[PDB]
Design a binder for this molecule. Structure first.
Ligand SMILES: Nc1ncnc2c1ncn2[C@@H]1O[C@H](COP(=O)(O)OP(=O)(O)O)[C@@H](O)[C@H]1O
Ligand SMILES: Nc1ncnc2c1ncn2[C@@H]1O[C@H](COP(=O)(O)OP(=O)(O)O)[C@@H](O)[C@H]1O
Ligand SMILES: Nc1ncnc2c1ncn2[C@@H]1O[C@H](COP(=O)(O)OP(=O)(O)O)[C@@H](O)[C@H]1O
Ligand code: ALF
Ligand code: ALF
Ligand code: ALF
Ligand SMILES: [Mg+2]
Ligand SMILES: [Mg+2]
Ligand SMILES: [Mg+2]
Ligand SMILES: [Zn+2]
Ligand SMILES: [Zn+2]
Ligand SMILES: [Zn+2]
Ligand SMILES: [Zn+2]
Lengths: 343, 334, 360, 29, 367, 364
DNA sequence: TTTTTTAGTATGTTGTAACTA
DNA sequence: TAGTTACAACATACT
């Protein structure tokens, strides 16, 4: 259960192998690369047949037991690949997994892939069973801050030269979507056998495809990055995200700012964060947001938000996206005239 | 389902029409909550289903009475919203309508009770029109509503209207004083808050609702001098917000009425709070605040799935804006 | 086998209907000439008799003697249609058959010849709420139905229908029956049933019917049931809360002078007695309209209301026409918002309080 | 302000004042 | 006896009213020989989409040859008119929406036509097809065999996928004009030996509102009411519209603050027995027309020739602002009309409101 | 007769393909160097050349000469593929075959070696119309494909595909086919067809195409029929006018310029089309709202409305912010009062009149 | 590092299990 | 002795 990174996975496999491998993450690209590497190493060691399966509450629990019993003392080298439940592991899955740990042989290998396990699930019986029999590798998608380092390292792997301008363009056009970015680098290498890529070259063969979440949109509004806020909304609209989800996510943060701003007049702001259990990393954005915004702007934002909610619920209007764009610009400190607000 | 003394006269009149064999297949009974309209309908349905009636009262020993007491009768249908749903759908109505067309299982009459026709959806109401207009032989419909105006016009034209009047105030207050132990001022305030409907006032006292009202008054007492109306969010944000908004509206009206000069006031138990409202607010502001409080209450009850905290938070912030000098006020529209 | 008046007195012949002369004349001419159309659409307010006319039309088409505008009412086809168990007359409750699959099954049925009658009428009622797919299915067959099929449609809100379906059928718009027509019909029905009645009682019922004869019969049954088997002015007045002599006049006079104490006392006394709050507003509106007419011309006021002639004329000379409009507008808003108020009394108090602020 | 416009405001009727007379092409007078 | 719309159909390209641009394109294509394999017809109701498409099928499969002027006498022509031609396959997309039906259709295109030169598939109300149905047709529609043509008719082409549109030639019909509708009605009635009057036909054409099926339906109703005659009196009563002279006279009285005349007109209107909603609508319509004329002299149409000079003088005299005040006042009255105790009371009070707030001659205000 | 322009002028070589440099260049390098993947995905707008490129790639791999970026186009294999009667090339219409029952039969014969070709290429059109089971069957056979088969995927909706299939194939995203590129191809086709044309006619058709070359050919064929064997600017301009649907943007431009005659002409033609007047006001409100936001920030306008980006930008620069607010407010009032107007047509006209002249008098 | 969702009614496609012609 | 009907899961459109 030694947490590592996919880059170190190849070195770890070369040094030696184990009965089980448990890699958790939410990045499809990293999971596929790790799965291929493990499969390649297993094939080299002499494995001839491999198995794939999925684990979830919908899957029959007795079926998992039969798969565990399928292992035999005298059998060829086999590999079994499993997938964690979409929602997450539960007590029954723990019983099935710990049963598998008892039924382990060198011939059979255990591979499970899925989302990161919550701290509550860390203390599960099955996890403790494979404390030493398995290794752990995180496969979380790098954030925008850490993205450029990953791109440069990946480019160096394919012996390609990327300028600073080219690196920024790739991150901007493929933020949160590594699979497209990985293939984008491959296509550029085919186009230019020289191996050196500049700003004019990359721009020709780069399209727009990125994945965002409502939390990113809220974060942009607090910081004040108007360009990102509009860009995120456009991507979310193209994807087909439900407007109601965006309203609720913004509601909790907006209401918190109103409460903090109103009651911070006569008390230090540090105490307010402590009693509201505000995350440490977010203290910086909250503090600057309150100073930039004013009470009048907050009231207008609440009024605009309320009208948008009413229109969606009863009027069934399709202009909800237009209202969101107006609200985003309002929170970016740039003045917005009336008539658009409060109807 | 408690039978109340004042239902004695109305019940006798209705039974006579059915006992004479000249009843109306559709009956609409309107009454305020807590007036025991369900009990009146329940008694009528029990009499109709009885196979060997004994005057007005049911025998209580025939097969029909035994099945009715057990809670299952082949020819007794009920239409009510689901446990988590606040409205009655069209699938249920079509289910009952199809079953009515078939021959009676027990060989007697068939009775359908609608718990609240005000909760019917537009699709549900229309599906009920054709069957309600020309029902088959020996079929009786009973409906209960709080306000027939909201009911569909075509549907309302099918049924015979019957109105239950609340008893006189002096009779009501005496009845409450016997049921519970409270001062006269408290009894009058509860009765007037419930629109003079006994039993509804009893519900306020028997439950914990009265304590919530006291908290609201104390919070409102502190907000008016300082003007920090935003502090009232804690006392108003609750699953029973429509009830508490009604209480707040009543306080505003009493203060406004006192400003013009009047004798009767709904809130008689707390003269101090209404006095503060009149002194620190002008009549124009009170009317503006009262108008939106009623409007927001209607949206909260009418719109399904509407968030509660956001609406109330906007209300308090909006009200604080009005109190500032040089701010226009809303006007009724059409 | 007792049945209410609204169900017992359904018309069985064209001559038995009330009003709608233009609709009957057009239908009678078409049958006589032979200019028979495929699809007919009847629209109007509730209780006007769209279903009654449509059912009568079906009887004439399939009558044994021939296609005539005066059904005999004695032949086998006529009686069965009256009972409602005629094989060829297919009646569809569109309110409960919104599903498209039901419509598709219906279309496949029309290909077959009629059993006994020479026409196969498809009477569709409450057709204003079929699913969009159901409407589009009817378009192709409705445009060019087979020789031996007819379509009769009835609706109350034709605005919801698609424009395409309307263009394929003849539209007959029915008007609300007049007060005199309603009153005459009520007197005729009561006389045939041997039930006592009074002149003013019928006038009140007809006035409250608001042009719907279905509603008039419903009120008549309610009065009879609670009127001890007879219709009397005192019984009807108690049925629907009606102000007696000057309940509205006193209230408006206090409102105009902006006297808070008088208005609240009058409302409190009225509440204790018990009256219809909506009726109070209607009468107050009527007085304001009459006062406005007097200002336009002193002769507008009728001679019947001579008991309070002096008081009303004094108001007309004292209040400018503009202020009368404000009071009239405010009371209309109160009536609009009365059903949505927390309490009916509470809504009225809000309406009166708003009007008291107009006075300087 | 005047009483006429105030009463119209309370009555729910808006007043339109001409802004671009050149747009109209005729003897508007 | 037979319905006019069903009895009278275009059996030749010369019998269609309007839509000249579409006919010109079709005639040129057949003559030159540049025949496509996918046609899409769009427009409002009763414009002639099905009639035009049916005519096109007649030309392609005519015995003489591919011509833009079908003979109308050969076996193929007459059978298509009767709608029982083997090689003319007409599909009701409204009643056949499931993809299973669509796949059944695609399994028959391969077989050669029985007797006709081409196997023409005419799909009506194609916008009702399911999403999967569109994609099933998508591949075959691009490259059909040599002996199949697809004709599509839809009232709302916006529902179709973008891909389907690019694979076919799209012709958008236009609503017929008043003069075109009037001329057609004159020809039909004259051929039917039915008397008529010039004013009655104008009213019917105006009420048609850019459709020809509507006009024919109204004509059938009018004939029945008039016992074989189409008179202006019968049509006016049927449409429930009073002559513009009465409505204009009432407006003229209102602007001059002649309340007594206004009351007299209302009493006469009550005796006439016309819905009070109609009076407000017509008064609003005239006021709107005056504003349009005041904007541009050419706004007024040819239909209102009888009262042309009466409206022109009103536009010159009344300032634009006054027209707005009268127009808006009636709109508010129309909103509150349902809530008034009676229709007469609602309309009468609305007029008194205008007189009370007259721009130049208000009612006398007492001290 | 005379075939159709779309069917007749199918591309037959990598040189005939218009644009798409970033796709053809990559394919040519891959085939020449021998680095060939097992799965290819093509995505782009409708009628942009996804199927045409796929067939060319298949012909190059299976050509007699070898794996060459430029197929000879003369050997037996090349002609058979073009005619669509080549055994080793299997073309499947996924739209018409969605159930997994048919998919299994197709995938059973993947193990068998090609009869007469180096590779057995499976071409799947509209692959986004496959059921859940079909994707599972396709994924199963695609995880471990034989070295002697290839899979070419073409679709316009890559989102619907499962992420598992996307991660196991190289995807090329075809770009919109410019404007001038469409014009050049039309000029080449017309003169090769001996058809008269004018510079104005081609430019109008190119803009109406909106990035799709198939649309241009369909419009060009329609224009020729209307022009009676010729493509004249008069005939083309009339045809496009009959198909115009940009009334709302035209109204805003006329409204700002204060042209009563222009506004009425737009309304008259709009009525002839049969537009819903309620819809017209809503879309006009959206345009006014969009223009206001563009003034607040230049980035408020996205790529969704690139067809009219230039016109929208011009309005923002010239019109002061106050005028936009006044016009937007007036239309809001008009929409509310539309139901009670004497007619929907009259309601829109009156509201537009109040937009040209007159302005509301607000309280205080 | 951890947070996200209005509700009702109607239509269409694919896959699996139980009961009847 | 094998097919049809009914039920479950997933996706889309309009109010
Ligand atoms: N024109 C009429 N003449 C005679 N009776 C009528 C008329 N209109 C309505 N009624 C009465 O009202 C009752 C219901 O009318 P109905 O046919 O249901 O009209 P609708 O279709 O509008 O509901 C009938 O039983 C009939 O007695
Ligand atoms: N251009 C036209 N010329 C002659 N008659 C027409 C024309 N358009 C419509 N009609 C008449 O309208 C009737 C219905 O037309 P229809 O075929 O339904 O058109 P659509 O398919 O557009 O609804 C036909 O009987 C026809 O006589
Ligand atoms: N890049 C291109 N170069 C030349 N012609 C093209 C191009 N893209 C599309 N076309 C034209 O579009 C027509 C149909 O293309 P199609 O195979 O439908 O492409 P898609 O599969 O993208 O819809 C062809 O006749 C072709 O001439
Ligand atoms: F017209 Al009805 F019930 F009023 F059918
Ligand atoms: F048959 Al249509 F518009 F009614 F084509
Ligand atoms: F976009 Al296509 F065939 F229409 F690939
Ligand atoms: Mg009816
Ligand atoms: Mg048609
Ligand atoms: Mg293609
Ligand atoms: Zn009993
Ligand atoms: Zn008979
Ligand atoms: Zn011929
Ligand atoms: Zn070759």
């Amino acid at each position: 259960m030694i947490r590592l990174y996919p880059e170190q996975l190849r070195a770890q496999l070369n040094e030696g192998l184990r009965a089980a491998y448990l890699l958790l993450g939410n990045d499809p690209l990293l999971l596929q690369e790790s799965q291929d590497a493990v499969r390649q190493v297993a094939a080299a060691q002499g494995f001839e047949e491999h198995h794939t399966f999925s684990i979830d509450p919908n899957t029959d629990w007795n079926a998992i037991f039969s798969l565990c019993q399928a292992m035999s003392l005298f059998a060829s080298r086999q590999t079994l690949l499993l997938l964690l439940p979409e929602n997450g592991p539960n007590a029954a899955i723990n019983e099935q997994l710990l049963t598998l740990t008892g039924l382990l042989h060198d011939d059979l290998l255990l591979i499970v892939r899925g989302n990161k396990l919550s701290k509550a699930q860390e203390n599960a019986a099955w996890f403790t069973a494979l404390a030493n029999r398995s290794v752990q590798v995180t496969c979380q998608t790098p954030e925008q801050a850490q993205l450029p380092r990953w791109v440069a390292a990946r480019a160096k792997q394919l012996n390609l030269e990327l300028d600073d301008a080219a690196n920024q363009v790739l991150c901007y056009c493929y933020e949160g979507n590594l699979l497209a970015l990985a293939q984008a680098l491959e296509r550029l290498s085919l186009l230019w056998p020289d191996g050196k890529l500049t700003l004019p070259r990359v721009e020709q063969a780069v399209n727009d495809a990125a994945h965002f979440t409502p939390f990113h949109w809220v974060d942009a509004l607090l910081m004040g990055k108007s360009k990102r806020a509009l860009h995120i909304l456009q991507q979310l609209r193209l994807e087909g995200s439900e407007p109601v989800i965006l309203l609720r996510t913004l509601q909790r943060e907006l209401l918190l700012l109103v409460n903090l701003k109103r009651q911070s007049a006569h008390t230090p702001l540090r105490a307010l964060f402590d009693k509201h259990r505000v995350w440490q990393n977010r203290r910086g954005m909250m503090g600057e947001a309150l100073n930039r915004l004013s009470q009048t702007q907050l009231r207008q934002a609440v009024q605009l938000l309320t009208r948008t909610e009413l229109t969606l619920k009863q009027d069934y209007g399709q202009s909800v996206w237009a209202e969101l764009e107006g609200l985003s610009l309002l929170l970016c400190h740039k003045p917005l005239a009336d008539v658009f607000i409060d109807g | 389902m408690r039978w109340y003394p004042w239902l004695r006269p109305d019940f006798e009149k209705l039974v006579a029409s059915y006992q004479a064999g000249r009843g109306h297949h559709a009956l609409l009974i309107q009454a305020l909550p807590g007036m025991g309209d369900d009990a009146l309908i329940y008694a009528l349905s029990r009499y109709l289903l009885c196979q060997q009636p004994q005057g007005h009262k049911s025998c209580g020993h025939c097969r029909g009475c035994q099945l009715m007491q057990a809670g299952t009768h082949p020819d007794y249908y009920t239409l009510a919203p689901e446990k988590g749903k606040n409205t009655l759908g069209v699938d249920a109505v079509r289910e009952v309508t199809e079953k009515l067309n078939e021959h009676a299982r027990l060989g007697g009459a068939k009775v359908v009770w609608v718990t609240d026709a005000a909760l019917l959806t537009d699709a549900a109401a229309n599906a009920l029109l054709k069957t309600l207009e020309e029902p088959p032989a020996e079929t009786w419909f009973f409906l209960a509503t709080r306000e027939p105006e909201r009911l569909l016009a075509t549907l309302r034209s099918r049924c015979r209207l019957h109105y239950l009047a609340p008893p006189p105030e002096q009779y009501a207050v005496t009845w409450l004083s016997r049921e519970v132990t409270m001062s006269q001022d408290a009894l009058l305030a509860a009765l007037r808050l419930s629109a003079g409907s006994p039993g509804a006032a009893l519900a306020l006292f028997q439950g914990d609702n009265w304590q919530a009202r006291e908290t609201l008054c104390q919070a409102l007492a502190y907000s008016v001098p300082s003007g920090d109306w935003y502090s009232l969010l804690a006392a108003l944000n609750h699953e029973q917000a429509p009830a508490r908004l009604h209480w707040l509206a009543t306080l505003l009206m009493d203060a406004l009425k006192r400003h013009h000069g009047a004798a009767q006031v709904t809130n008689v138990d707390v003269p101090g709070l209404v006095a503060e409202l009149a002194n620190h607010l002008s009549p124009s502001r009170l009317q503006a605040i009262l108008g939106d409080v009623c409007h927001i209450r209607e949206q909260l009850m009418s719109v399904t799935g509407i968030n509660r905290e956001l609406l109330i938070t906007d209300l308090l912030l909006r009200i604080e804006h009005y109190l500032q000098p040089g701010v226009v006020l809303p006007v009724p529209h059409l | 086998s007792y049945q209410v008046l609204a169900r017992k007195w359904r018309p069985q012949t064209f001559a038995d209907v009330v009003g709608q002369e233009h609709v009957l004349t057009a239908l009678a001419n078409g049958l006589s000439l032979g200019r028979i159309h495929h699809a007919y659409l009847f629209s109007g307010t509730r209780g006007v008799g769209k279903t009654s006319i449509a059912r009568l039309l079906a009887k004439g088409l399939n009558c044994e003697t021939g296609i005539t505008a005066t059904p005999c009412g004695v032949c086998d086809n006529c009686r069965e249609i009256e009972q409602g168990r005629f094989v060829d007359l297919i009646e569809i409750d569109a309110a409960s058959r919104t599903k498209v699959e039901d419509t598709r099954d219906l279309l496949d049925n029309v290909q077959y010849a009629p059993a006994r009658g020479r026409f196969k009428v498809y009477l569709i009622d409450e057709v204003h709420m079929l699913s969009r797919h159901s409407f589009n299915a009817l378009l192709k067959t409705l445009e060019e139905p087979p020789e031996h099929v007819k379509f009769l449609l009835a609706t109350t809100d034709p605005q919801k229908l698609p424009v395409t379906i309307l263009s394929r059928c003849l539209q007959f718009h029915l008007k609300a029956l007049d007060v005199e027509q309603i009153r005459h019909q009520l007197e005729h029905i009561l006389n045939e049933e041997h039930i006592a009645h009074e002149p003013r009682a019928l006038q009140l019922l007809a006035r409250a019917a608001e042009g719907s004869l279905r509603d008039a019969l419903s009120l008549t049954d309610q009065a009879i049931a609670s009127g001890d088997g007879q219709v009397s002015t005192q019984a009807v007045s108690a049925m629907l809360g009606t102000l007696d002599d000057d309940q509205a006049l006193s209230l408006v006079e206090a409102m105009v002078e902006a006297n808070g104490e008088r208005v609240m006392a009058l409302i409190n006394e009225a509440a204790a007695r018990g009256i219809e709050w909506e009726a109070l507003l209607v009468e107050m509106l009527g007085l304001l309209h009459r006062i406005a007419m007097v200002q336009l011309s002193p002769a507008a006021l009728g001679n019947d209301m001579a008991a309070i002639e002096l008081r009303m004329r004094e108001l007309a000379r004292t209040i400018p026409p503009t202020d009368i409009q404000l009071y009239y507008q405010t009371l209309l808003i109160g009536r609009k918002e009365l059903p949505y108020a927390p309490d009916r009394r509470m809504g009225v108090e809000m309406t009166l309080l708003r009007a008291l602020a107009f006075h300087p | 302000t005047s009483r006429r416009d105030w009463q119209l405001q309370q009555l729910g009727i808006t007043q339109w004042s001409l802004r671009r007379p050149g747009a109209l092409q005729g003897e508007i007078a």
